[PDB]
């Protein structure tokens, strides 16, 4: 597993922008969005991994991700708790 950040695809970012109401997109937006998503995922995953390690488990459950998002201030519904 290496250089997986390119999996965030240019049409995917365009679709997300269109859902966000963006009409025209510059060519340099995609790298910035990739970096932002990388940072956000890093933070959430670090918190979730800490939660799982506390429970003496090795499988990251959806409850741990929900708790991590709630701690970050981004409480998510529909995945328990």
């Amino acid at each position: 597993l290496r250089d997986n950040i390119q999996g965030i695809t240019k049409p995917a970012i365009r679709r997300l922008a269109r859902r966000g109401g963006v009409k025209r997109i510059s060519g340099l937006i995609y790298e910035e969005t990739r970096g932002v998503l990388k940072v956000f995922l890093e933070n959430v995953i670090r918190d979730a991994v800490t939660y799982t390690e506390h429970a003496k488990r090795k499988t990251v459950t959806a409850m741990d991700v929900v708790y991590a998002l709630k701690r970050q201030g981004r409480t998510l519904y529909g995945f328990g708790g």
């Binding site: 597993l1 997300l16 859902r19 009409k23 510059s26 990251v60 459950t61 741990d64 998510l76």
Partner: protein
């Protein structure tokens, strides 16, 4: 026939705002999540529900950031979104 610029963009804006489906393929996101997690701790298993929750949260965050970026672009009398717009939105949001 060729639609004038901006019409198809608005049409897909309406299409993607009508729906609620996830816009990022599941396998690339799962790979990215495993790649990010392998740095913090090796031999970690992700449940499918956890990955789906991560994808939903990430898509919601990116949609909100794109809304803020478009608001920044309308400010200063523009239509295109530029990296400076994202940077301004993030800086006002309190990140970095």
């Amino acid at each position: 026939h060729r639609y004038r610029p901006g019409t198809v963009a608005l049409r897909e804006i309406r299409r993607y705002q009508k729906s609620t489906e996830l816009l990022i393929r599941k396998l690339p996101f799962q790979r990215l999540v495993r790649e990010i997690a392998q740095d913090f701790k090796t031999d970690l298993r992700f449940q499918s529900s956890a990955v789906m929750a991560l994808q939903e949260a990430s898509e919601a965050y990116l949609v909100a950031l794109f809304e803020d970026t478009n608001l920044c672009a309308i400010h200063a009398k523009r239509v295109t979104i530029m990296p400076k717009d994202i940077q301004l939105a993030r800086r006002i949001r309190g990140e970095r």
